[PDB]
Design a binder for these strands. Structure first.
Ligand SMILES: [Mg+2]
Ligand SMILES: [Mg+2]
Ligand SMILES: [Mg+2]
Ligand SMILES: [Mg+2]
Ligand SMILES: [Mg+2]
Ligand SMILES: [Mg+2]
Ligand SMILES: [Mg+2]
Ligand SMILES: [Mg+2]
Ligand SMILES: [Mg+2]
Ligand SMILES: [Mg+2]
Ligand SMILES: [Mg+2]
Ligand SMILES: [Mg+2]
Ligand SMILES: [Mg+2]
Ligand SMILES: [Mg+2]
Ligand SMILES: [Mg+2]
Ligand SMILES: [Mg+2]
Ligand SMILES: [Mg+2]
Ligand SMILES: [Mg+2]
Ligand SMILES: [Mg+2]
Ligand SMILES: [Mg+2]
Ligand SMILES: [Mg+2]
Ligand SMILES: [Mg+2]
Ligand SMILES: [Mg+2]
Ligand SMILES: [Zn+2]
Lengths: 116, 60, 126, 155, 99, 82
RNA sequence: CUCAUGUUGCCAGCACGUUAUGGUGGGGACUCGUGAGAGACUGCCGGGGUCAACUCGGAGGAAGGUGGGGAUGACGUCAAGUCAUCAUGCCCCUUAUGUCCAGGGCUUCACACAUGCUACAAUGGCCGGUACAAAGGGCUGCGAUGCCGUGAGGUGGAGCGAAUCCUUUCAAAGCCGGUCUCAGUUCGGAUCGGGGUCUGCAACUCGACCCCGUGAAGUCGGAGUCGCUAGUAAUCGCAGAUCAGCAACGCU
């Protein structure tokens, strides 16, 4: 199915179909399905339009997903890079901010390996 | 261990957090066991000399 | 009164023999309920099978310490020894079968500097 | 092994059926030392093979081992700065053990999506002569009879 | 019915055995009933130290701290017996706690 | 992050200095030797000279950086690249 | 194995419990924990042996030919490590290279190496039921029952200088029931954001734990190379050392 401009899987459980939404995850999906009362093992062929609409209304009322989340994360990024914070400098240099072992780790952030 | 540092450590600190062992004689701040009050080498030497009534080698 | 004790890898057991039926009482529950393992049942019944006096002795078992296999083997040894005590005439066949010889192996001391038991840390010449 | 031939352990027999080959198979397939798991999986796959083939599991296993057990092998040897291979006869006991080893190896590496059924199917294929194990035996015999020439070394 | 838990707790087996023997003899002479030195599990304290400073840590060794404790439940705590126990002088290797 | 029950922590001497500054309405550069002092809304228009170990570097505070420590905006290490 | 031995430990045989289990009166008939003694010495037999050492096989026995593992480094070599343990000869500072404190650092990285855990999915991930051990720590410390939190934890605080009270009835794997039909996966979890707890006067550089969103590389691996011959190799757990807070996947 489709929801908030996101194409749900052709055949997959709703606990992962909702997970695939940017603003919803594994335990969040578990919590929303528990609150709604919908069993979590059913496949993507058994959904109904009214349930999708009510779920959309609930999630939009009690959460922000996708574009709003991305733009507010980027807003945080630009404000922290403008205020001259340590996190801003770390973003400028392209490194994790917690201060991990960048000597050897942080390969995921720095991306591929280049030989000098 | 520097005698000045040993004396300063013995003095009462202005904060309770600043309390540390500083092994009594050799003044080694590291590798010290609380109950003994002595560091690894101090324990080794005293036990080998037999000066503590009750420690002895291990074979079980 | 007939009493016996069996020990193996820290598995102390108690057995009391009774010429009544072939009932197995393991801490108030039957053998099939307690440690439901075919290998277990087989090894526990091995002595009575060898002596060919099945369905003639009732045993009550109290178990402390050890593991499942240890307790099972200790119980086997205990019933074998109790059977010998009540009738030593089966001595030569039972000793030939090996039911009356205890198993003198258990957890051994492990070295300082070694991970456990006999383990050895990675030893590289680089 | 410098002092001499070491003693051999007294391997136990299977009480479920009565053939120590089952014990050997479970011991070979032991992964991470899970005896109960390995034996239950082996029994389940044996029952699957039985219901698939409609015959005696012990008889079909005997047929498979008889078909797949080799009799000649190849050993590596280098002399005069050049590497060569020599064929040497093998004891039937070691032949059976290595046949079990190859059975496990080729029951590890195929794409049937479920190894419990797949090991049974591999057993059926080996019994029928279309198995990867019998293909490997064919290749081994071909290599041995090709290198027959260097048999004069006798080592 | 009153019982006094005379706690015997020392390091050396010889010392603890000698102290226990002296206590048994004193109690027997004074005329009181004592169960005896009931054995108790011996607490084991193991400490590991390195060979020498500046590395060379692969080879180690352990030190134990032997502690032997014995239980002495004395029944019928006669005033004479308690006074005698107070006046008995024992070696420094044995410390007796009365509870 | 500091627990809410304990609340923000501000050094007494710097609190006194900033209180005097904002009460007298004078705005000047204050030599700051404290790196553990949290920001308070009262610092909206105050300039602080934080010590990085080499020289007191002045910093201008606005409402934007509320909820962040003073040392966050004062780099301690110089990294020119390679 | 024999003797001595019964509490805070166990129960043969008798009584009280009546759901809470020796819990309670009682009891060494065995372990249980710590004292003494015996037992492996080619002990005996047959063959080889220079009639000698030594060796193969056999009977009794728990062990058969140093039963198993340990404490246990002969003279010396590597001018091997340690004036940053301590002490020690000589040079050097003494108005300093000594001494007290405020902030920062030892955790910086366009890369490399070595040791470990997580894996790379079904021998499995996940959910419900369910049985089996050891040993040790606990005073300015463990912390019961009860109540509120998803859970970090918040209130409270019985029993304990400790076979007694806590570290859960010490469990994990194990057995039964249900989903997944092989996907970059319901495997797998790092990175990056939004909310809290705990110790500390002082958590941004710089701690740890709980909740959420985030969903990257990785499908058994190149020449080369490492450990392991019986409770051995593999796999899954528990406690302690340093410690108010932890870098705890390391060590014992
Ligand atoms: Mg300190
Ligand atoms: Mg020290
Ligand atoms: Mg090395
Ligand atoms: Mg009793
Ligand atoms: Mg030498
Ligand atoms: Mg030298
Ligand atoms: Mg030199
Ligand atoms: Mg000097
Ligand atoms: Mg000198
Ligand atoms: Mg000088
Ligand atoms: Mg100086
Ligand atoms: Mg200072
Ligand atoms: Mg450092
Ligand atoms: Mg791990
Ligand atoms: Mg709560
Ligand atoms: Mg439990
Ligand atoms: Mg994850
Ligand atoms: Mg993840
Ligand atoms: Mg995990
Ligand atoms: Mg990949
Ligand atoms: Mg893959
Ligand atoms: Mg290679
Ligand atoms: Mg600590
Ligand atoms: Zn010292």
């Amino acid at each position: 199915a489709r929801l908030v401009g996101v194409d749900l899987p052709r055949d997959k459980r709703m606990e992962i179909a909702l997970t695939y939404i940017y603003g919803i995850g594994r335990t969040r999906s578990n919590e929303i399905l528990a609150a709604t009362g919908i069993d979590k093992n059913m496949r993507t062929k058994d959904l109904t339009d009214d349930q999708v609409t009510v779920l959309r209304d609930y999630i939009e009322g009690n959460l922000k997903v996708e574009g709003d989340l991305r733009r507010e994360v980027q807003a945080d990024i630009r404000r922290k890079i403008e205020i001259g914070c340590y996190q801003g400098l770390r973003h400028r240099r392209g490194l994790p901010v917690r201060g991990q072992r960048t000597k050897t780790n942080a390969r995921t952030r720095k991306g591929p390996k280049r030989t000098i | 261990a520097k005698k000045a540092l040993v004396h300063k450590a013995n003095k009462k600190p202005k904060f309770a957090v600043r309390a540390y062992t500083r092994c009594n004689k050799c003044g080694r701040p590291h590798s010290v066991y609380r109950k003994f009050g002595l560091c690894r080498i101090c324990l080794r030497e005293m036990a080998h000399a037999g000066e503590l009534p009750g420690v002895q080698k291990s074979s079980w | 009164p007939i009493q016996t004790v069996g020990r193996r890898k820290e598995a102390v057991v108690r057995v009391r023999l009774v010429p009544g039926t072939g009932q197995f009482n393991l801490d108030g529950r039957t053998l099939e309920n307690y440690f439901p393992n075919k290998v277990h049942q087989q090894l526990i019944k091995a002595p009575l099978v060898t002596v060919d006096r099945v369905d003639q002795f009732d045993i009550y078992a109290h178990l402390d310490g050890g593991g499942p296999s240890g307790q099972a083997g200790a119980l086997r040894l205990a019933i074998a020894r109790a059977l010998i005590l009540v009738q030593p005439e089966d001595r030569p066949a039972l000793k030939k079968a090996g039911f009356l010889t205890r198993d003198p192996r258990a957890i051994e001391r492990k070295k300082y500097g070694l991970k456990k038991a006999r383990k050895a840390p990675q030893y590289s010449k680089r | 092994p410098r002092k001499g031939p070491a003693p051999k352990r007294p391997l136990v027999n299977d009480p479920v059926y009565g053939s120590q080959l089952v014990t050997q198979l479970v011991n070979k397939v032991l992964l991470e030392g899970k005896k109960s798991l390995a034996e239950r999986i082996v029994y389940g796959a044996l029952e699957q093979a039985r219901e698939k083939t409609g015959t005696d599991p012990v008889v079909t296993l005997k047929r498979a081992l008889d078909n797949v057990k080799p009799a000649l092998e190849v050993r590596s040897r280098r002399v005069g700065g050049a590497t060569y291979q020599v064929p040497v006869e093998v004891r039937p006991d070691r032949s059976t053990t290595l046949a079990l080893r190859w059975l496990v190896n080729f029951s590890r590496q195929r794409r049937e999506k479920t190894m419990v059924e797949r090991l049974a199917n591999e057993i059926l294929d080996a019994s029928n002569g279309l198995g990867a194990s019998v293909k490997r035996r064919e290749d081994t015999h071909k290599m041995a009879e090709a290198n027959r020439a260097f048999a004069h070394y006798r080592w | 019915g009153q019982k006094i838990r005379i706690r015997l707790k020392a390091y050396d087996h010889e010392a603890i055995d000698a102290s226990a023997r002296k206590i048994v003899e004193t109690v027997t002479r004074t005329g009181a009933s004592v169960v005896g030195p009931v054995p108790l599990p011996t607490e084991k304290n193991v400490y590991c130290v390195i060979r020498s400073p500046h590395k060379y840590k692969d080879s180690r060794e352990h030190f134990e701290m032997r502690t032997h404790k014995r239980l002495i439940d004395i029944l019928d705590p006669t005033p004479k017996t308690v006074d005698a126990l107070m006046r008995i002088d024992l070696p420094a290797s044995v410390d007796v706690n009365i509870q | 992050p500091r627990s809410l029950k304990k609340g923000p922590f501000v050094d007494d001497h710097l609190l006194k200095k900033v209180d005097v500054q904002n009460e007298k309405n004078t705005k000047q550069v204050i030599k700051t030797w404290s790196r553990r002092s949290t920001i308070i809304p009262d610092f909206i228009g105050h300039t602080f000279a934080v010590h990085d170990g080499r020289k007191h570097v002045p910093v201008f505070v606005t409402e934007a950086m509320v909820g962040h420590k003073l040392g966050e905006f004062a780099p301690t290490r110089t990294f020119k690249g390679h």
